[PDB]
Design a protein around this ligand. Structure first.
Ligand SMILES: *[C@@](O)(CO)[C@H](C[C@@H]1CCNC1=O)NC(=O)[C@H](CC(C)C)NC(=O)c1cc2c(OC)cccc2[nH]1
Ligand SMILES: *[C@@](O)(CO)[C@H](C[C@@H]1CCNC1=O)NC(=O)[C@H](CC(C)C)NC(=O)c1cc2c(OC)cccc2[nH]1
Lengths: 299, 298
C-alpha cells in the first residue's frame, strides 16, 4: 500500500491556541512563552480592506489581545511584529512545547497541515508547496493561523502559517518568520497566482513507489537523455529535472533496479499517450505531491 | 475535497509496545489495560497454525514486556478475548482519553495511526471496504496499530491491525478482537471476497458536488429503494440499507434533493456513463467519503 500519510499531530496540537482582538479571531501557535499568529488579527473587517499594519499595531495595547489555551486565558505581557506574523509574549510558558525549528521550505517539498478552528485541532493532512507557491489545502473560515510542519526524530520543523484562500480555491501563507510564500500579501483582495507547473521529481518518485508496490504496467523498453526528457516535460508544463533530482532518486532506482532515465522514458510515454483510462496506485492522474523522501519513508 | 485524518494526539498518548520473546508489536494502553493482537505470544514457527488457548497456557504475566517508550509497565494480569490480548498493568495511563470501542460497518471511514515499536509514524484516512479490507499502508512491525474516529473529544476505537493479504490490502479486528471479514490470525495466505463500490459514499459524493454547484447529473426521475438496489448490484455496487438512507438525511435536507432522486441520478450514471463529463473535477466516482466526511469538509 501507498497512501498520503501525515505526521502524527500530537506535538503540534498541544501548541494551538485561540487569539482574539475585538471581533477578529483566529489560531495561534504557542511555543515557550510566545504565541505566533497572523498579524491581521489586529484588524477590524474594515481595516483588512487596506491595512497599514505598523500604524495599526502601535495603536494596540497588550490588553487588547485575548489568548485562550483551552479554557485558560494567558495574559499578553508584550507584542511585536515580524513581517506578517504577530509575536505575543505571554506570562506562561507552554509546558507542552516540543523541540522545534522554523524552516522555509522549497517548492515541491511536502508538509503536514493541522487545520484548526477557534484554537482547536480539526484534521491533519499532507500538502506540497506548489511551484507557484500555493498549496492545495482544505481550509475554511477561521482556519487562519493553522500551521504546516514536518517531524524528524521528535523535532518539529514548522514551515507554514495559514493566511489566505485565493479565488481559485488554493491557499497562501507565510513561513514562521512571516514572509509569504509567493507574490501574495495579507490584504482582503482577490489575488491570482502565477501559472502552476507539475513537480516532475515527485511524479517520478511516485512511479517508483508504484513499482515498489508491485505495479509496472506503465514501464517501457525505451530510454531518454536528460535534456530530451526536459524538452518534453517543459512542453507539458512540468518542472525541469536536474541532476540533483536524478541523484535524489538514486536510492529508489537502486531499490527497483530501474535507472532514473528509464523511468523518465516511462513518464514521457504517459505524458504523450495519456493513461488511456488506466490507473496508478488508485489514481487516474499523475500524482506530484510525494517527495522521494515521502516514498522512502513510507516504503 | 481531500482525505482528512483526525488529529492523532489523543491516540499517540495511548500507544505502547508489547514484546513476548523476540516478537514485538504495538499495544493500546487505556486506563490500566493494554490491548494488543494475541499473536504476540507466538514464535514465528507457532504462527503457521496456532492453538492460542494452548499457547497462552504456557504464558505468565512475567513473560510479557510492555513498554511506554523504554519505560516498562509491570503486567499484573492477562486474558484473551477473541483475537486480542488484554494485559492488566499496574499503572493507569494518565493520557487516557474519553473513549469507547465500536464496530464499524463497510463504507465507514476512520483514521489509522501507523505505529512501529510503540512509536507513532504517520496518520491517514481509510475506508472499510465491503469485503472487510482496508487499503492501508503498513510495514513489518505495524500490528497493533489502531483506527479511530474522534467525536467531541471522545475517541471511538474501531480497528486494530493484524494482517496484510497477498493482494496488498489489510485486515484486522475491532477492539474486542473480532475480525472484520472472513479472516484468521495465522500465517496463511487468505483471500477476501470480491469487492464492490460503496454506494452510500458515492451518493455522498454526488451531494457534495451539488453543494458546490456541480449538478448536471441531476435527473428528472425517481426510483424505489428496492428497484435501485437490484440495478446497483448488477454494476457491482453495494445495496443500500435503511441506515444508509438515514445517514444521507442531512445532505438531502441541505440540498433539497430527495435520497431516492439522487439514487435515480446515480442509476443513470451507471447505465449510460458520464459521456466524457466530470464531477468535482474527476472522471471517476469517489466512494471513500462518507456523508459525515462531506459535511465536515463542506
Ligand atoms: C483567515 O482565517 C482569516 O483570519 C482566512 C482563511 C480563509 C477563509 C476562507 N478560507 C480560508 O482559508 N483568511 C482570510 O479571510 C484572508 C484575510 C486576509 C489575509 C486579510 N482573506 C482571504 O483569504 C481572501 C480575501 C479575498 C477577497 O477579498 C475581496 C476576494 C477573493 C478572495 C479572497 N480571499
Ligand atoms: C504484524 O506486524 C505482525 O505482528 C504483520 C503486519 C503485516 C506485515 C506486512 N504488512 C502488514 O500489515 N502481520 C503479520 O505478519 C501477520 C501475522 C499473523 C496474524 C500471525 N501475517 C500476515 O499478515 C500474513 C501471513 C501471510 C502468508 O502466510 C504464509 C501468506 C500470504 C500473506 C500473508 N500475510
Amino acid at each position: 500500500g501507498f497512501r498520503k500519510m501525515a505526521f502524527p499531530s500530537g506535538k503540534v496540537e498541544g501548541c494551538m491556541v485561540q487569539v482574539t482582538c475585538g471581533t477578529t479571531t483566529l489560531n495561534g501557535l504557542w511555543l515557550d512563552d510566545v504565541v505566533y499568529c497572523p498579524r491581521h488579527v489586529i484588524c477590524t473587517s474594515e481595516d483588512m480592506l487596506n491595512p497599514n499594519y505598523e500604524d495599526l499595531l502601535i495603536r494596540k495595547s497588550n490588553h487588547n489581545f485575548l489568548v485562550q489555551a483551552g479554557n485558560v486565558q494567558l495574559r499578553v505581557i508584550g507584542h511585536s511584529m515580524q513581517n506578517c506574523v504577530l509575536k505575543l509574549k505571554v506570562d506562561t510558558a507552554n509546558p507542552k512545547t516540543p523541540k522545534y525549528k522554523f524552516v522555509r521550505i522549497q517548492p515541491g517539498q511536502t508538509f503536514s497541515v493541522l487545520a484548526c478552528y477557534n484554537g482547536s485541532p480539526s484534521g491533519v493532512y499532507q500538502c506540497a508547496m506548489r511551484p507557484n507557491f500555493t498549496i492545495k489545502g482544505s481550509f475554511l473560515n477561521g482556519s487562519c493561523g493553522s500551521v504546516g510542519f514536518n517531524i524528524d526524530y521528535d523535532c518539529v520543523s514548522f514551515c507554514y502559517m495559514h493566511h489566505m484562500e485565493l479565488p481559485t480555491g488554493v491557499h497562501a501563507g507565510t513561513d514562521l518568520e512571516g514572509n509569504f510564500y509567493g507574490p501574495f500579501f495579507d490584504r482582503q483582495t482577490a489575488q491570482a497566482a502565477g501559472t502552476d507547473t507539475t513537480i516532475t521529481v515527485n511524479v517520478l518518485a511516485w512511479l517508483y513507489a508504484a513499482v515498489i508496490n508491485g505495479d509496472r504496467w506503465f514501464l517501457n523498453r525505451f530510454t531518454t537523455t536528460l535534456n530530451d526528457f526536459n524538452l518534453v516535460a517543459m512542453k507539458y508544463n512540468y518542472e525541469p529535472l536536474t541532476q540533483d533530482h536524478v541523484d535524489i532518486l538514486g536510492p529508489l532506482s537502486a531499490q527497483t533496479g530501474i535507472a532514473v532515465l528509464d523511468m523518465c522514458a516511462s513518464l514521457k510515454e504517459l505524458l504523450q499517450n495519456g493513461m488511456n483510462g488506466r490507473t496508478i496506485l488508485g489514481s487516474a492522474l499523475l500524482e506530484d505531491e510525494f517527495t522521494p523522501f515521502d516514498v522512502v519513508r513510507q516504503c
